[PDB]
Amino acid sequence: TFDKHDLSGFVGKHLVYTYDNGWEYEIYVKNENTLDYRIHSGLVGNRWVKDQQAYIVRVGESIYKISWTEPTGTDVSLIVNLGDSLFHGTIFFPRWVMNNPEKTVCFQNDHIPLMNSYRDAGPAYPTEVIDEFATITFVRDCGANNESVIACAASELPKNFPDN
Amino acid sequence: MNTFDKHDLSGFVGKHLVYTYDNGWEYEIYVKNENTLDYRIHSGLVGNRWVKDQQAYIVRVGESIYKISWTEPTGTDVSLIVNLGDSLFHGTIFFPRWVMNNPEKTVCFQNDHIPLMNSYRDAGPAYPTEVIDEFATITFVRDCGANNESVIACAASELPKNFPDNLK
């Protein structure tokens, strides 16, 4: 009843959400195969990333899936159910990230060699699976390829974010 | 509140599915209970591999749509979507590099060989990770109840040639 590869209902979406473990995240679906994201709190609070290549598909009339692999070794797969305002994430963290998560807290784009070095040193295993629903607290449409959406770490945002 | 209980898995526990990814690889899963699956691979990169009692994270993300994710003794990560209402299936598999290089090393009844899988995982190379992200066509679905040890109990190569027509 719908086209699986029509992502026009999802590209441009800018979401802020809080996982049931209390961690607050933000994503911006920048185009059909790219996102920016910004972490506000939790294990890796203040980490942020631009231009992450991702696999984005439509799995229901208003439900989308977005998955990717990171320079740290982390794998991620998210479900965004816009029709029901439901969000679910699975994050597969390498063991070294669980052991010292602050190592990943940076603007990653300026530190890809560092992340790769940490990844390759490990320990990679055992993988830690974080699997949680989240509450979507903000959603807007910011179009494709909008570099103004995520342009600083969360700590540099106005205190009333996203009320602005 | 949500119009369904996202924590209620009763519509998915017990499900037995056979499906073929868009690249022709045929797989089979059995949702054994709220945090466990058995699975059986028929063809593709790792055809004939099968696994019982894989711990998994199983959730409901829509009225008739479920998600199942897990990590393996080989280092592989998996996350699947089963949309029963629309008969839609989507899988993402994150394979370690060593699995791409020598997939046959994983082709076994894994439960007989878990330490070996861990040894291969640890030897690596783990990276770069290979992502397989594909829709599949569901070709068979039935309900088998929870904790049914007869659903997946041999390698695919040992199934009758008319499988799953021999079942229901």
Q: Which of B92, B93, B119, B122 to mutate to test the interface with A (most CBs of A within 10 A)?
A: B92
CB A92 within 8 A of CB A75: yes
Helix (H/G/I), strand (E/B), else coil: B123:
helix
The verdict on whether omega for the bond into residue B160 sits within 30 degrees of 0, i.e. cis, is no
Nearest to A70 by CA among A116, A38, A114, A102: A116
Write down the number of H helices and E strands in chain A.
Answer: 2, 9
| Helix or strand (DSSP H, E) at A119 | helix A112-121
Range of the domain at B96: 1-168
CB B38 within 8 A of CB B17: no
| Helix or strand (DSSP H, E) at A67 | strand A63-69
Q: Is the dihedral of CA A50, A56, A60, A62 positive or negative?
A: positive
Residues 23-82 of B with CB under 8 A from A: 57, 59, 61-62, 65, 67, 69-71, 75, 77, 79, 81
**Residue of B2, B86, B133 lying closest to A86 (CB–CB):** B2
Which residue of chain A has the CA closest to B58? A131
* Distance between start and end Cα atoms, chain B: 37
Residue B17: is it exposed, middle or buried by C-beta count within 10 angstroms (0-12/13-18/19+)? buried
In three-state form (DSSP H/G/I as H, E/B as E, the rest C), the secondary structure along A75-102 is: EEEEEEECCCCEEEEEEEECHHHHHCHH
Resolution reading in Å: 1.1
Contact B94 A75 (CB under 8 A): yes
**Residue of B65, B126, B131 lying closest to A59 (CB–CB):** B65
Encoded amino acid at B62, one letter: G
Which domain CATH number covers B147? 2.40.128.20
Nearest to B31 by CA among B63, B7, B59: B59
Contact B61 A57 (CB under 8 A): no
Compute the distance between CA of residue B70 and CA of residue A36 in angstroms, rounded to an integer: 25
Helix (H/G/I), strand (E/B), else coil: B92:
strand
> What are the catalytic residues of A?
25, 70
Experimental technique used to determine this entry: X-ray
Compute the distance between CA of residue A84 and CA of residue A63 in angstroms, rounded to an integer: 9
| Helix or strand (DSSP H, E) at A143 | none
Both tokens assigned to A43 = 């294990």
Compute the distance between CA of residue A103 and CA of residue A118 in angstroms, rounded to an integer: 8
Nearest to B134 by CA among A119, A43, A157, A57: A57
Total tally of structural domains belonging to chain B: 1
Compute the distance between CA of residue A128 and CA of residue A113 in angstroms, rounded to an integer: 23
A126 CB-side CA count, 13 A: 9
